[PDB]
Design a protein around this ligand. Sequence first.
Ligand code: 5YE
Ligand code: GLU
Lengths: 276, 281
Amino acid sequence: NHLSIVTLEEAPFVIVEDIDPETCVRNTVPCRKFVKINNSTNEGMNVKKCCKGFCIDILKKLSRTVKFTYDLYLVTNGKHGKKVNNVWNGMIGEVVYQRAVMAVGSLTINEERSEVVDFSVPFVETGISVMVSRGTQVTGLSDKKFQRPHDYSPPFRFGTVPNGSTERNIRNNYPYMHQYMTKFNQKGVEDALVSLKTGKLDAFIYDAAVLNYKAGRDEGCKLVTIGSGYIFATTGYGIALQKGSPWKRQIDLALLQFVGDGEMEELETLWLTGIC
Amino acid sequence: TRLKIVTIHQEPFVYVKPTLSDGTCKEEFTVNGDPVKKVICTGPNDTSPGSPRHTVPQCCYGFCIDLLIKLARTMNFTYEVHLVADGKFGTQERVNKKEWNGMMGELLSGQADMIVAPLTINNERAQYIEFSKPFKYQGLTILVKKGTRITGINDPRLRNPSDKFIYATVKQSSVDIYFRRQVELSTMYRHMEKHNYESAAEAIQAVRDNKLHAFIWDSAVLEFEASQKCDLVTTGELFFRSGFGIGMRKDSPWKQNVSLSILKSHENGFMEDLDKTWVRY
Ligand SMILES: CCN(Cc1cc(=O)n2c3c(sc2n1)CCC3)c1ccc(F)cc1
Ligand SMILES: N[C@@H](CCC(=O)O)C(=O)O
């Protein structure tokens, strides 16, 4: 019952901090990250860091109720999970290839991942949202500005952070929109928000739970999600486990217990509320 | 390998109507001009508790019937639909022995192979059956007659009750389970257990008839009801959030493919289209 668990940093779900001057204190848990010595070697060191956040508090509650201990580590081969040349990388890959018993974080449940890992019941609703400057007129993902962007002079400028569940959905559903958007790929959420705030981007398409958190914390309440926080292709965040995992039954029941007794609502108040 | 599906009457998820004289279903069309898909569902006629039940073919349609048709097409199974004999969703009651009633009991006894209905996923039921990934996310809210003043779940008329302001839910439902388990709601639970209704339709009617001052139920059902019956309104937001899933026995060979089909339908807009067709407007 000592389990290898993988995570990925994505505030406020998983937040990574440097260790004290030399253990993890307060509401943090130890988490390690493999860091290369240089680029001409495979040699590296596990660096001891500290992790906290909404998903970490869920892990702490699961560890206590389900009765397991764990060795938490940060994924270094990709991010959430993408199938590249039929091989899964990121958190999904760590679980698929049995390096981790489970993956905890801002991990989106989708059909293709569910074919290779089992997911727990969802603990947070997510999907796709559209972030814009307040007042921008867009009807949703079906808006002609997104579907047929060159029908506008100048064309609407919009992008996502590639290789995650959002880009996969756009590629599957809207082929033209997808090939158009790639020139607007953002390195991460922080870069995308700066691009929107400075008028270099008109819309940012990304994970609903993250966008709704970011809109709620925006300085001047300038950036909002369209349709008053509308969520397209609704899914949720789930704990990924190996297919046929003996831990799935107890994890599912504990998550449903936390929702039922108000423990989940208490975590949302602690980590996900915003002024906007 | 013909699946027995159990359902329950619950607009807009499951509409239940009499068949025509010839035993077929009335041909109907949506606002889009598309034909309404209907299935024959056998069930008892409305009767008082403790009475013999007489089973007759009826017509079934709605969000959950469209969902069943899509699952049957994708997974290549045939089926027969029946309405839950006792008219209930399902709770576990003490008889040392404990037994499940409603659709829960039917599935566990093999009378049904799948529950296709607005069935709330909760810890109590998941201990005994397998739920698919959710097909709808919603929660609990309160229905009142327009003019009734309630702030919500924290209203003193709810938290400190008397025989002057009557509120209730549906018997042997997930709401009944929620209020019974949560000790913080025990004052509310004790008031409700005196006035709970046999069905959501009876409770909604009682609110209209001024027999019930507040009805505590599923927001996906109450908001649809309020949007049609303009003499009724929901009060506040959701005080609790929950999802609906498909119910199957833990050893079902269809469990993985049910959830994959549900995920595919969320991702390609099919579920959003069903929601727009039935639950919105
Ligand atoms: C129906 C859309 N939905 C959102 C959803 C559904 C849902 O019951 N819950 C619950 C959470 S958070 C959540 N989000 C806390 C209480 C129950 C979804 C669909 C497919 C999935 F695989 C995952 C989620
Ligand atoms: N949560 C997403 C990452 C962000 C996104 O692509 O929207 C996933 O698990 O892939």
